[PDB]
Structure formats: structure tokens, C-alpha cells
Amino acid sequence: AKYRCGKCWKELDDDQLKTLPGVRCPYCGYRIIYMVRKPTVKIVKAI
Template identity: 40%
Template sequence: MSYKCSRCKRDVELDEYGGVRCPYCGHRVLLKERGGGIKEVDVK
């Protein structure tokens, strides 16, 4: 899954055993990348 570090803004790929930490700067706050699509919801 693709994440972006909130401090250095680099793309980060996490493996399931590595924990949550940026391998470049060591920061522990990562933001999940969102898809480019827009969801439409029908409201009744």
C-alpha cells in the first residue's frame, strides 16, 4: 500500500513487518494516498 510521509513528503511503501516509520527521515506520521476517482452516492 502506498503512503506519503507528512514530514519529508516522500512516497513510502510499507511491508507488514517493518512497522510504521518513514525509512528516509524516521518520522512516524504517514498519510494514505487516495485514488483519483470520485465516488458518487445516490441519496433517496
């Protein structure tokens, strides 16, 4: 899916298409990336 660079918390977004020899942010060269919230309406009951 889509990822987000871990440096400075919410840095920038990248996708599957960035094929690199290792897990690395193409922009800042950071080795930790996270996953996006999969934009979709989520229903939660205010109980």
C-alpha cells in the same frame, strides 16, 4: 497501498514493501504517515 511521509506535509512516497519493526518513514524516520488518493477518475457533479 501507498503512503506518504508526514514530515513537511507532502514529503515523499513509500509502499507496503517497506517492512520495519514499527510505523516509520524509512527516509526521515517520522512516525506519522498518510494515504494516497488512489489514482482513479472520480466524477463529481457541479451542483
